[PDB]
Structures are given as C-alpha cells and as structure tokens.
Amino acid sequence: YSGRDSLIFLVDASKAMFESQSEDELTPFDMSIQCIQSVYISKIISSDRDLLAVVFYGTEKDKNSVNFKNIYVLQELDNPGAKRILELDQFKGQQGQKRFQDMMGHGSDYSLSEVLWVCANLFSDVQFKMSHKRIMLFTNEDNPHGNDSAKASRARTKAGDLRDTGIFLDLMHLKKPGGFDISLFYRDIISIAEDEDLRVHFEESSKLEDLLRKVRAKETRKRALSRLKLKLNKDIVISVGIYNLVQKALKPPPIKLYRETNEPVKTKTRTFNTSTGGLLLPSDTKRSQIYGSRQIILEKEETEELKRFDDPGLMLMGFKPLVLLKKHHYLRPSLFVYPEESLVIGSSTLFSALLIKCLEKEVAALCRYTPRRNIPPYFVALVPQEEELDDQKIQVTPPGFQLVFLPFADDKRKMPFTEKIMATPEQVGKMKAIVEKLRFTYRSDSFENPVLQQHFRNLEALALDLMEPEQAVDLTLPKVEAMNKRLGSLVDEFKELVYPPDYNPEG
C-alpha cells in the first residue's frame, strides 16, 4: 500500500435534509456536519498527509471547475486543517444552518451525473499518488430521480464509470420519515452491495457511529526499519527485514515560532573561536577526554573507529534451547524479522524451513546483530513465531522471527543480600482468594497513554478555540472503589493475619 488516501464528502442540500421527524433531535444536515468534523479531526490526529474534500449539491449557488449548476464545492481536496474545521463548524448550529441557507441556498434541482463528474474532476486535480479514492454521500432521499428516468440512467452510467476508474462510493443514508430503501435506486451505485443491507432502513446508518468515534492514535504505514543479511556461513547468506511491531509513541516535537507574528523561525548553530571569532571546520576541532591529570586527544574518525567490530547484519551462531532464555532477561524492546526476497532470491524458502524446524525442535537461533556501521555488536536471539489468527480468519500474530536482545554481563546489576521469609499456608490461601477476587482479562490495547491523549485534546481545544479542553478518562487509574467493593472483608482478614496489630504501614 503506497500513496495517500483521498476522501470527498458529498452532502445533500435539499429541503428534506433540514427537517427532523422528532423534536430536539439534530437534523440530518447537522449530523452530516458533525460526522465530517469528526473525520477531519481523526485524520488530523492520525494521518495529516491525507486529502479531504467537501462538496455540496442541490444548492442554488454553484462553484465548480466545470460551472455545473446547483453544485457547490466548499473545499477542494487538500490536507485537513483547523481552518477547514472552523469553516465546517460555521454551519453546525441552527444559526449556522441559516447562514448556510443564505450563503448557498437549497430546494434546487440536481443530477447525480453532474455531482459524480465534479467529484471525478476533483480527484483528477490531485497531483500526488493516491492509494484510495473514496466518496461519501450524505443524503436522506432514496429516490433522487423518480420523475425523470434519463437522469437516473445518466447517474447509473456515471457511477459505473467511476467504479471502473477505481473510485469507491459509500452511501451514508440518514434518517428518513418513510424509511430508506437502498435496493430502490442506490443498489446499482454502491461499489459493494451487502446482502444484509437490503431491507428498508428506518434509522440512521450504522457507519455514522463509526465515523463519530474519534481516534486519537497516530497511524504509521508498514515500513522496514532495516534490510539486513543473515549469514549462516561465509558463503551462505539470505536477506531479511527488521520491523518494530511495538514502538513507543512520542508527542510531536515543539516548534519555535516568532511570538510577534506566529511564524516559523529558522534556527542556526555556529561555532567560532573565542579569540578570533571565525568559523571552525570539523577538522579544526578534536575530541579530548580528561582522566585525572592526563589528557587524551582523539579525532572524530578515530572515535568512530573505536566502536566498530563487524559490518552491519546478523551473523548466525548456534541454536539454543528456548528453556535457557530467561523471561526476566529483558533489555530492549524486541523486533520482528521477516524474509524480504527483494535483494537475494531463494531466501524465503530457507527462512520458512528454518522457522518450521525451530518450531518443531523448540529452539532459538542465537546471532550477533549489528544494526548500522560503526555500532558495537550485540547478542540477539531469533525465536520462531508461528502465524496465529483469531476468529473470522484475521491475522493477529504474523509468522517470522522475534529478535530479543540478550543483556551483556555489564547490563545485569547485583542485588543486595536478602533473607528469604516464607508464608504459612493460611496466608497463601487468603492471598490467593484476594487475587481471584480481582481477576480480569488483559489485552495489549486495553489502556490509553493519559499524557498523549491529554496533549492531543489540549491541542485540539487550542486549535478550535473550544470553551474548555475535553478532559480525558485515565483508564490507568486503579479505581480502588471497585476493588474495595469486591474484596469486602478479605483485606481485613489478611491484614490481621499478616500485619501485627500495631504496624501502621504509613511511616
């Protein structure tokens, strides 16, 4: 998957879109605006390089590159930003609805052929490489062209042409007083027609909930950290790639700005002599270290040479039983090794055979790892990882090797001498009961980084000038109330059985 993702929001501007069957319920236009704003925010937070566009049809005023009547292109395909979100929010409220009506209008004829044509033209206008061309239609009318059959045929032909071109269309049907029937007219326009999605829908589309569910996690496309060579022998070599299936998430770095006008400021670092003031070339300077009363002078090239043993790659040592790999011997986050085949042919078969045999024999390949040039070598273990998929045949553990760094002797630290004290069976049983009372199921994605979420919410509030930032819910808190409620008296029994009567575990 290479390229960007392009999205166009087609929002109907007919009269029916401004009427609500019930009272105190947001109108379909307001719901579409909210969903578009949520998608904009999600794109900004996750992947800001994508392109989003907003086009309104059925209005009176028109703004298109083809001058088509009753079609307004509010925002062309461009990277999302705060200005676009504010422009969309301008029409969010009822006052915003009236402002939209005055600015563009409503209750005007339209043709799906023209809107599809302008959407295709907008897609063509883009100059980058798009990995996904998508259109979303926000409307509450299931029979846009019933009076005229020629318009329906033209719309069907345009939809088919867009489908062949490679444009994926979705219909975000909204609430309709009489119910929405996709099979009536839109069955032939949707890119993929689901068998279940054939009955008359008397409520909102389920996709609206998904769109409104904001996501505040950066999304990174698959990328190889480094393509290296695994050398079983001097004359035997295969090509593999290393990926970081788990990587720490850091907030975007701060940017220096000119306080007077809030514009980027270029930062320049210069080195000059204290006696002359002229610029110093890298050869002019030297690296020195002081040890007591002795000084040692080394050049940059010599310092780089100091940490250099072997060329980058993985040198395969002998295999070791997995029982000898201690679980508590953790130094650095593990990596994933997968065959590449883009540099040397036939490596995939050897990798597969090695993985199968390692799984059968329950062994791990010990190797010497050197990520980059002039980097000291380290010891790693490649543990086989068999492909595992959960329900619905969806991969959850890719097949390959798990690269685990084995700490050196210097990495380990000795612990202070301690005296072992054992607990009587009654205390062990009481603590087992306490533990069982708090049993729960753990998943890798059961927690949210409170700092990152709070920073993202504060940034969004500042960008949109909201009344107050949305306070995040810290799922990392222990919520001691539930623990107290579940444990009941067990804590008191454990305390009176273990802790002497006069302990005061507070100082």
């Binding site: 788990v246 980027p264 400021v265 320049k268 002078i297 650095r332 597969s352 049993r439 222990p478």
Partner: protein, 528 residues
C-alpha cells in the same frame, strides 16, 4: 562514600616464563588480566585503592623482608589511587624473574601491607587476588595463622591459575584450556591446599572463587567482589484503598553506557575555552531578520496549521499525576502477557522493605499465590510526580536464594503497530522440500549450543552470552591506553581474545561444516 582496597599479587618466577609452543605463557595471561582490571578501575573514575606486590622478583622490598624471611618478594606499589604509572609499569618495565618464591609468603606480605596501610583511611571491602602457577615449593607451617588472620580481618581472597579445575587453544574461546595430563606434581599438591583454604574462607561456594586467566578474561569475575550496589527505590504496593506493602525496587537489568563523554577542543590549543558554541534565531525572509531567544515562543503542528502553545500554558494544562505510585490495577493469567509486547529500557526487581518482617511475609505470600495461580499483576508505575505514568506487568520469581517480583513495562494502545505479513506455510511458491527440511534439521542439530548432561540429566549452555562482558568498553579502554602511552601511533586492532570470546566454541564450528555445505548445495540462493 563506598571505597575498597585491592592488592594484586604477581608471580614473576621462572616457571611463569616457561611456555609450550603455540600457547601463551601464564605470565602474559596474568599481565593481560591485570591490565584489564587496572583499565576498568582507572577509566571508570571510581575511588578504590589498588596496590601491587610481586613475589619471585630477583630483588627484595618488603617490611617483613628483614630476618632472612620472605626473600625475593617486592612491593611494587603500596595502596594508592590507580594511575597510568601502574599501567606503564605492567606493560613494559615488569619482566619475569629467575628466582622462585612461595605464594604463602606473598599472601602474608599482602595481608601485612593491607593491615599497615589501612589505618588512616576508611574501607568496607578488602580483596586480595593471587595469580600463581603453583609450581614452586611452599611451607604449610603458617597456614593456621594466615587463615585466622583472614577470618579476623574479613578479607576476601581470590585465586587465578593457568588451568581450570583437543583443538588449538584460544584465549577465552569457550573451549578447553591447558589440556589434562600436563600438570606436574607440584601444582597437584598446591591444588588441595588452595582448595581447602578457600573452603575455610567461604565454604563450598569458595570452589567457584578459583578462576583461570582465560576464564577471567571473559567473565568479569575480578570485579565481582568490588562492584557496588545500585540505589533502592522505596514505594508501597497497594492492591486497594487499605492494603499496602512497603517495597523496594532495584534495577535488575539496565543497559550500561560510557560515563565519560568526549569533549570537543580546538586542535591548536587543545582547550575547551577556545571553542565557543552560539545559537542564533532568524526569520524566514530575504532580509534575514534576527529575533531574540526570549521573543521565541513554543507551538505545535496541527496538520498544516500552526497553533501557538506557550510553555506556561502547556505546564498549566499538562496532565497531572501523583508521584511514587505502585498500584495493582488487576491480576491476569500469565498466558495473556507475552514477552513480545514488553517495552521499556529496564527491568525492576521488587523486594520487601529492608528491615521489615510483616512486609516480607506479605510479599512472600503474594509471590507464592501468584506462582500457584499462574498469574501476573498488571500495575501502574510512576517514578515520581514528573515521570509519565506507565502500565506494566509484575510476575513472581522464586529462587532458593530469594523470592521477588519482576516488573517490566507494557505497551499502550498508541504504541502498538498493526502490520500484515503474508503467511509462509500457505505459500506454495516458497514451500520447502522434504530433503531441505532434513538438511535444516541436521544443521540445527549440529549447531546446538546446549549439551545434555546425562549424569544429572540437565542442560549446560556451551555459549553463555549473558556472562560475556560488553566488548565496546574493553576496546575503548585499550584504545585510550594505547593513545595515552603512545601519543604518535595508529590505534591497534581488536584483541584476539575479544574475538575469541565473541565467537562460538570451535567444536560447533567444526561440527557444522558438512551440514552447512549441504544447506548451500540444497538451497540455490542468487543475489539480486
């Protein structure tokens, strides 16, 4: 703070000079070990006193020399902070002597020096390392007195020999050294005395205190008794709002980096003052306007839109957390936590608060319960009020020596990458062949790094990489010493023993030739 005193007894007898062709002499190995020890001690900038006494020298320099006793014993250097002078003496101007000497006399003089010099200074760990060949006569009449003095003074003792308790021999090559039957009667006699004195000093564990030069060159054993202990982090493990156990956490495993940092200096003067670093902020305009640092403000990118974010505003709106929190979020089956997802750059070992019995028994009960139920504790960790909160897993670790919790950080949702990789088992194009599978099986069997000892039906690791010291520090120390002693000379190449210790035993290499050739012939690999 923490200080130690170390005495190095060096054998310079004629027997040390003697060597077999193709085998480095014991004197060279002892010199290398001492050089490595002094390198680490001096370049680490640690305050520990080091003294060197040579026994077997032609001359005599010893307070107890008078009286026609302890002859041919010289005290090269008394207790003082290590300096480059000691390394220079070791490298060049310390040659073997033709006069034999008794190692017991060397130990006696070392103890006398320790007692005499340790009057005006405070020490908490005295260690004496004895390097001999045990190929000289000795008197056993003084064994009782020296043992009693060692017991009274609380002085640790270590012994290094050219042999340990048939391809080419290598220094630290994870292979046999000093093949059997090459030991004479004198060293056989010395073995029992050294073993029994070590047993009396420590007991059965003392048998592990007798290392070898080759073994010590790749085991970091010389610093075992001199290494310090990391500070303790005290906190309270809380399961609810009432239960709480006082605990202390140490860093069981942490990546070690060079403490000293390279300093940039001007070549002409070789001084820090000459080089000055300045930062200038300018606008992006033709005029190249310059703006003061105070004028600069902090901001963030919001998808092509720059939103100002002042540092004071960020501090005011920054997420606030309570520092020094170790709370048990819940308990989950150990199978639900996988080593793949472990994050962070450290592992914590949590014990009960020192000098505490109730906390000790409570922690032991919790550890035993977790082990019996096969469960781990998902907990919240925070070093202080400024450290970002973390979600980690604590699991039991029970050993005959001690029982403690082991804590490793766990990843957040934002820290997980979802990558899709094509399956290999279902790939017909890359499907292997039965002969290829057999060849790979043979290769794996040949290159096994663990041996099954049938005497105890156990597994012994032939290549314990965990015990190998980091080679980067040794290389840095060697290069620094070479530059200091030889200002005008290119840096030397990597020492052979370093490569030998970083390479697997020659046995597996020799036993994997035929399987490797089979793999090469059966697997057609063409570079692209």
């Amino acid at each position: 703070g923490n200080k130690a005193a170390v005495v190095l007894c060096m054998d310079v007898g004629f027997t040390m000079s003697n060597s077999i062709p193709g085998i480095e002499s014991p004197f060279e190995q002892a010199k290398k070990v001492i050089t490595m020890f002094v390198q680490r001690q001096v370049f680490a900038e640690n305050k520990d006193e080091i003294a060197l006494v040579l026994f077997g020298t032609d001359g005599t320099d010893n307070p107890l020399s008078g009286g026609d006793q302890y002859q041919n014993i010289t005290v090269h250097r008394h207790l003082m902070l290590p300096d480059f002078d000691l390394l220079e003496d070791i490298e060049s101007k310390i040659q073997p002597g033709s006069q034999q000497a008794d190692f017991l006399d060397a130990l006696i003089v070392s103890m006398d020096v320790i007692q005499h010099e340790t009057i005006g200074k405070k020490f908490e760990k005295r260690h004496i390392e004895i390097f001999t060949d045990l190929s000289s006569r000795f008197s056993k009449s003084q064994l009782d007195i020296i043992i009693h003095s060692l017991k009274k003074c609380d002085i640790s003792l270590q012994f290094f020999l050219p042999f340990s308790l048939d391809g080419p021999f290598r220094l630290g090559g994870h292979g046999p050294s000093f093949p059997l039957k090459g030991i004479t009667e004198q060293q056989k006699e010395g073995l029992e005395i050294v073993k029994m004195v070590m047993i009396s000093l420590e007991g059965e564990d003392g048998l592990d205190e007798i290392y070898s030069f080759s073994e010590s060159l790749r085991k970091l054993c010389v610093f075992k008794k001199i290494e310090r202990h990391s500070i303790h982090w005290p906190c309270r493990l809380t399961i609810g709002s009432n239960l709480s156990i006082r605990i202390a956490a140490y860093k069981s495993i942490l990546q070690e980096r060079v403490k000293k940092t390279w300093t940039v200096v001007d070549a002409k003067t070789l001084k820090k003052e000459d080089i000055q670093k300045e930062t200038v902020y300018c606008l992006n305009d033709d005029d190249e306007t310059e703006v003061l640092k105070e004028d600069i403000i902090q901001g963030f990118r919001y998808g092509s839109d720059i939103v100002p974010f002042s540092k004071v505003d960020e501090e005011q709106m920054k997420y606030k957390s309570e520092g020094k929190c170790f709370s048990v979020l819940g308990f989950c089956k150990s199978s639900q936590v996988q080593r793949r997802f472990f994050m962070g750059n450290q592992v914590l070992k949590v014990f009960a608060a020192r000098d505490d019995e109730a906390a000790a028994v409570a922690l032991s009960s919790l550890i035993h319960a977790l082990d019996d139920l096969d469960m781990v504790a998902i907990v919240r960790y925070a070093y202080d009020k400024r450290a970002n909160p973390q979600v980690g897993v604590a699991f039991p670790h029970i050993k005959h020596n001690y029982e403690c919790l082991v804590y490793v950080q766990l990843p957040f949702m934002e820290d997980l990458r979802q990558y899709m990789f094509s399956s290999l088992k279902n790939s017909k194009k890359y499907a292997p062949t039965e002969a290829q599978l057999n060849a790979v099986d043979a290769l794996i069997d040949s290159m096994s790094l663990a041996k099954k000892d049938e005497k105890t039906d156990t597994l012994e690791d032939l290549f314990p990489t965990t015990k190998i010291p980091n080679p980067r520090f040794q290389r840095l120390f060697q290069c620094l010493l070479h530059r200091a002693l030889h200002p005008r000379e290119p840096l030397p190449p990597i020492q052979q023993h370093i490569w030998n210790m970083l390479n697997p035993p020659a046995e597996v290499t020799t036993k994997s030739q035929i399987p490797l050739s089979k793999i090469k012939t059966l697997f057609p690999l063409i570079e692209a």
